[PDB]
Amino acid sequence: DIQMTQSPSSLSASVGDRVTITCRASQDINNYLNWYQQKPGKAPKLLIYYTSTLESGVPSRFSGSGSGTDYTLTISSLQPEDFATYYCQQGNTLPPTFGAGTKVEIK
């Protein structure tokens, strides 16, 4: 299994803020890195795939970058609906593996 390390594991921010979430894989993942959002009691939903492509309908305040082992997700202006848990997942090698999650909490 390729190990995925997500950081911060939690952060406190306020509405309007810019924040960046990071995911490091244990080896080069060749840009096969995807991001999911999950709210309490609900199934995960795709935000970004293949490092930078936004799924249709996902707000443009969300963007992704990275290369080799290091990948990031930035929200340019946090909205109320964005306080949630985020997961990255690598699709380079099977089985697919996920980061442990980043909880975005209100301050």
């Binding site: 199934a43 997961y87 593996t97 980061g99």
Partner: protein, 120 residues
């Protein structure tokens, strides 16, 4: 549209067996591989089992190998996970999810989750 709807689940004692279902609609069933993921309460997502409906290729995580079996009914467009010799560590919300292509290599549709609790 594409929809994945799970049912099955509930509560059983250690040693019990349950069969989860993931019924799909809206797309040609044999063209996409399908996976089971679980989320044990307060932990993250963990992959469990996958199957390619085109050639019947299956794969399993080491924690469930031998006890779980993934299968498909192509006439009913349904994915199944048979779970035998359940144990308390298998408590979780189980999700089925579709894998888009082999800018691909991501899960694009997720089922709503169904809870399995193993306790006496």
């Amino acid at each position: 549209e594409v929809q994945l709807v799970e049912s099955g689940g509930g509560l059983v004692q250690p040693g019990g067996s349950l069969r989860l279902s993931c019924a799909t609609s809206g797309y040609t069933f044999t063209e996409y591989t399908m996976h089971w993921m679980r989320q044990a309460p307060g932990k993250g997502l963990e992959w469990v089992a996958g199957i390619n409906p085109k050639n019947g290729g299956t794969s399993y995580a080491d924690s469930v190998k031998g006890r779980f079996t993934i299968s498909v009914d192509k006439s009913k467009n349904t994915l199944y996970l048979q779970m035998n010799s359940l144990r308390a560590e298998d408590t979780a919300v189980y999700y089925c999810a579709r894998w888009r292509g082999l800018d691909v290599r991501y899960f694009d549709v997720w089922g709503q989750g169904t809870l399995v609790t193993v306790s006496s």
